[PDB]
């Protein structure tokens, strides 16, 4: 699996994350920093939409007489005008925010792909479906290091070269 | 040996619309539009309304004989009339600036 | 009917106790109240498209 094919069920620890498999075990983990930052972003967005609304104590209804029909109709015009403006803006705002939010999340999962590729460089094969395969054998300690962003690339340099070289041809 | 990058998926069937696509299933969403209510009148900022019931504002202000139970309350958050008040003017006539009076009494 | 609660907004259909910015219960209200919208729903995405692998 991987972000290219679809999301994961069972990865309930966060919006974004990793799955790994090695000789010591396997399972899901959230990228806790990425997820919390994405959450803070979304939280600020939702709260901005809500908090910027000016809520004041009001008195909406107005009464009119038989010969105040023009005034009644103006009062109605005002309510319909404001209502169409707020309805149009609310519908449109939500649709626009939803397009950006879904794009935001797609961007963030790809950013994790770039985070890992940049960190691993050529010590892992890209699969193309959102996965990477190490050329070197990788235990639980290097899995944590990659997730942390502390992978000691030089440490595995020789092992990965030797494993890539299994298909080098002439040497 | 293998690291895969993914994202959350679950059993939710809620959907959203966007400008480019419609009926998109989403893992979690927030309804910003409130559609429920209590089905009953309540205390606005902790303060009860004046409930006129069968009486109209004119009934209560003029003191219609049938608005007797409405003349004991000294403060209110809002005024509530039944949808079509029956006890108002009991001796018919024009109530001048009635609509203005009801604006002035709207909060006391 | 009348009863007790902590209300912030009230419509003729009954009291509202809600923090959300919009409501579609009724156009005429009393009190500190969400804006009336003609729409049936304003669901904002916070999450991801729910498309499992």
């Amino acid at each position, epitope marked *: 699996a991987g972000f290219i094919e679809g999301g994961w069920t069972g990865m309930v*620890d966060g919006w974004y994350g990793y799955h790994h498999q090695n000789e010591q075990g396997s399972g899901y983990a959230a990228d806790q920093k990425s*997820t919390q930052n994405a959450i803070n972003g*979304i939280t600020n967005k939702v*709260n901005s939409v809500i908090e910027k609304m000016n809520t004041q104590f009001t008195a909406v209804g107005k009464e009119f007489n038989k010969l105040e029909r023009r005034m009644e109709n103006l009062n109605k015009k005002v309510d319909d005008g404001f209502l169409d403006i707020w309805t149009y803006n609310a519908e449109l705002l939500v649709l626009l925010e939803n397009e950006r939010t879904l794009d935001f999340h797609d961007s963030n999962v790809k950013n994790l792909y770039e985070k890992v590729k940049s960190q691993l460089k050529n010590n892992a094969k890209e699969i193309g479906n959102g996965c990477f395969e190490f050329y070197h054998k990788c235990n639980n300690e290097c899995m944590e290091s990659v997730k942390n962003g502390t992978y000691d690339y030089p440490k595995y340099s020789e092992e990965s070269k030797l494993n890539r070289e299994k298909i080098d041809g002439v040497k | 040996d293998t690291i895969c990058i993914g994202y959350h998926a679950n059993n939710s069937t809620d959907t959203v619309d966007t400008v480019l696509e419609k009926n998109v299933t989403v893992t*979690h969403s927030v309804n910003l539009l409130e559609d429920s209510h209590n089905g009953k009148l309540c205390l606005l900022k902790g303060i009860a309304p004046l409930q006129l019931g069968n009486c109209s504002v004119a009934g209560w202000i003029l003191g219609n004989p049938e608005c007797e139970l409405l003349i004991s309350k000294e403060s209110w958050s809002y005024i509530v009339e039944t949808p079509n008040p029956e006890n108002g003017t009991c001796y018919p006539g024009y109530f001048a600036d009635y609509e203005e009076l009801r604006e002035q009494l709207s909060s006391v | 009917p009348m009863d007790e609660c902590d209300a912030k907004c009230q419509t003729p259909q009954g009291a509202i*106790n809600s923090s959300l910015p919009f409501q579609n219960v009724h156009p005429v209200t009393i009190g500190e109240c969400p804006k009336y919208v003609r729409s049936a729903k304003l669901r904002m995405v*916070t999450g991801l498209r729910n498309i499992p692998s």
Partner: antibody
Amino acid sequence: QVQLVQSGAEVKKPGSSVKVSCKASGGTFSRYTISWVRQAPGQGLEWMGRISPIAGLENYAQKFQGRVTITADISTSTAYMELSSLRSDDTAVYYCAGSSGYYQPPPYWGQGTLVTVSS
Amino acid sequence: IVLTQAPFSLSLSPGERATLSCRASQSVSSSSLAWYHQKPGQAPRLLIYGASSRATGIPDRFSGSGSGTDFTLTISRLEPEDFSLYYCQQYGSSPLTFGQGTRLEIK
């Protein structure tokens, strides 16, 4: 800082369900993750689960995986824990606690409410 | 993950220094095992945020450190207020598991 207020104590018969509410005040509800913890009489704490009002990501302890539903609604600034198929084994004080982040321990614990399950 | 937080009871005189420690079957994420203090009848109070940060509002008598599968809480200048139960919580782990509870007695 957020302060949490819980519903009163309840007594239930075995097989019935309980819905324990929690309300937040003094801060922004939507900015805290709500985590529910069980205090067994005479014993320590057990985690039951958590919810983020904005992110969802409901996460439940395995023991109650098919029994407890945790919800939140930013509309009322509350969270609920609904536990089905009650057993006498479930007598405990249930605490609502807030956390400043999804991956942080909660420093803002509520009152705790006792739910007793008995004949 | 299995957390074994209460291997012993502890009995101290006020003014003394003592430590408590937690062990686990796997690593508690990265330095993410929190410490709690519970006065009978009260909700648990957070003392240590993560393996070692002091939680806001907590006195300087409390400190701690650790990593992996082995963490320690130290209390110096112990006061009557401290003679209650202690717990560990794996807030950085998938299940947010809690320890058993250790009790500190007054001599």
